[PDB]
């Protein structure tokens, strides 16, 4: 009920000539678009990637980004020139733009910039501004970008109008990939611990969607408090993976079960006995 839309741009600048920009677009944790540097056009990665935009609107949109990609390149190269020898190559720039939806006719948009892996600049209201912690030299770049009235107008439109309007289309066009259920499959394994007399039990859980999941080692009705659940890891077919580990005495593996809970099972848990 609370989906975030993220346009993520990655730009690398090796030196005064070499550069690349690739971006990917997400809606929650599903990928909607890809745009490799090596491609003239934006690639859809879902049948519903266009949401409820018409061709003329998409063509037009894709056109302005094409122009942006080239423009953005020359711009950074030129800011470097303005700031050097203060700041110099290699340079990494990342952008995260998009908006978040709320179950009213409600939304908030963001557009954040990182420089060398650090969040430094955002667009806010009608201008770019620096965030707390940013280095003061960025003021010149900002003063400059802010001088460009046409760009600010364009960026306001994108964040205030276009993006929400776009996404609400996507959310309707895309339900049932979004609301899809994929059942987890679980299996058990065991490894020696760095302790000189112990055993680490691992409960692998893979293939489930959406993300929310509950995995716990049980001895009957008893939840084993020492369960360490791992990070959520992606699969290539857009499902998730996760495991949970428990440290055990050698010879206390007796009668333990890993228990899995997920929306997809319809409330018949997976219980796997050792």
């Amino acid at each position: 009920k609370n989906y975030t839309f993220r346009c993520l741009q990655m730009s690398s600048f090796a030196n005064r000539s070499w550069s690349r920009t690739d971006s990917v677009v997400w809606l929650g944790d599903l990928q909607t678009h890809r745009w490799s540097n090596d491609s003239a056009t934006i690639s859809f990665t879902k049948p519903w990637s266009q949401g409820k935009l018409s061709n003329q609107q998409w063509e037009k949109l894709q056109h302005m980004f094409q122009v942006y990609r080239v423009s953005f390149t020359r711009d950074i190269q030129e800011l470097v020139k303005m700031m050097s020898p203060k700041e110099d190559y290699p340079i990494e720039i990342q952008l995260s733009a998009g908006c978040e939806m709320y179950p009213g006719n409600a939304s908030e948009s963001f557009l954040h910039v990182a420089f060398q892996g650090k969040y430094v600049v955002r667009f806010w209201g009608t201008s770019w501004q620096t965030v707390p912690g940013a280095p003061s030299w960025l003021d010149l770049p900002i003063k400059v970008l802010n001088a460009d009235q046409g760009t600010s107008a364009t960026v306001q439109m994108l964040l205030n109008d276009t993006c929400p309007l776009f996404v609400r289309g996507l959310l309707e066009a895309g339900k049932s990939d979004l609301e899809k259920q994929e059942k987890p499959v679980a299996w058990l394994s065991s490894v020696p611990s760095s302790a000189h007399g112990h055993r680490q039990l691992v409960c692998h859980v893979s293939g489930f969607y959406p993300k929310p999941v509950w995995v716990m080692w049980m001895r009957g009705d008893q939840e084993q408090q020492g369960t360490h659940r791992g990070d959520f890891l992606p699969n290539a077919d857009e499902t998730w993976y996760l495991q949970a580990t428990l440290d055990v005495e050698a010879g206390e593996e007796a009668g333990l079960a890993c228990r899995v809970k997920h929306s997809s099972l319809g409330g018949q848990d997976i219980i796997l006995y050792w």
Partner: T-cell receptor, first 111, second 113 residues
Framework: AAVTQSPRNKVAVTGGKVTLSCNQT?????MYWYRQDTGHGLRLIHY???????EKGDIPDGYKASRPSQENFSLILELATPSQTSVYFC??????????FGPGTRLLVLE | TQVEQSPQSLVVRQGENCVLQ??????????LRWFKQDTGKGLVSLTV?????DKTSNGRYSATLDKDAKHSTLHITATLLDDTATYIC?????????????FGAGTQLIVIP
């Protein structure tokens, strides 16, 4: 809000060193050197984003640039050739898109 | 280059109207500026056009911009002798100093007194 150039008019010999100066008191960061030849728009040679900075433009060969200060931007011809006979415009500007142009410098190089 | 002007030159009698065309392929096209240069002298800015379909006036000079057509015109009402000059179309590709100026080769105008 204006820019001066010196000299207005220069007669050099092939293989001479020539310095065309440009001076502005607008406190602009950015100065630009162009040349004008009949049948052509102005073409950028070198430019600058501040004292200490010089940057190649479209046709930099045969020229070096110098920005010793906020105020001053020079174009230097270490070895003049007849092909550098031209009228030379300097300009300056702040963060905005407007560039303010000097009155120009008519230069002639001779054998 | 990326900015074409037309005509290359023209001769008009004092008091007559004339119109000057400019056509370009500069991308992006933030703004377009028209300059008057007298023989010998430097560049005097006449007017700058910024909008998608802009129109500007300044004394006896008026101008239009169509960014779709990437086309501008400069009208002069009731020419005077001092209009004898070269008129230059300039397209700028940013709304800031990060931009480069794209110069037309100009249009020479002679006014017969």
């Amino acid at each position: 809000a204006a820019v001066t150039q010196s000299p207005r008019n220069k007669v050099a010999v092939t293989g001479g060193k020539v310095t065309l100066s440009c001076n502005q008191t607008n406190n602009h960061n950015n100065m630009y050197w162009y040349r004008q030849d009949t049948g052509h728009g102005l073409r950028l040679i070198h430019y600058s984003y501040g004292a200490g900075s010089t940057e190649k433009g479209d046709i930099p060969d045969g020229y070096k640039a110098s920005r010793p200060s906020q105020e001053n931007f020079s174009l230097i011809l270490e070895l003049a050739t007849p092909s550098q006979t031209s009228v030379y415009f300097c300009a300056s500007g702040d963060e905005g898109y407007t560039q303010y142009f000097g009155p120009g410098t008519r230069l002639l190089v001779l054998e | 280059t990326q900015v074409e002007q037309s005509p290359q030159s023209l001769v008009v009698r004092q008091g007559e109207n004339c119109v000057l065309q400019c056509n370009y392929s500069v991308t992006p096209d933030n703004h377009l500026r028209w300059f008057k240069q007298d023989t010998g002298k430097g560049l005097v800015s006449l007017t700058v056009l910024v909008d998608q379909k802009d129109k500007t006036s300044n004394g006896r000079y008026s101008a239009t911009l169509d960014k779709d057509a990437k086309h501008s015109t400069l009208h002069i009402t009731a020419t005077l002798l001092d209009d004898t000059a070269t008129y230059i179309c300039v397209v700028g590709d940013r709304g800031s100093a990060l931009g480069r100026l794209h110069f037309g080769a100009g249009t020479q105008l002679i006014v017969i007194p």
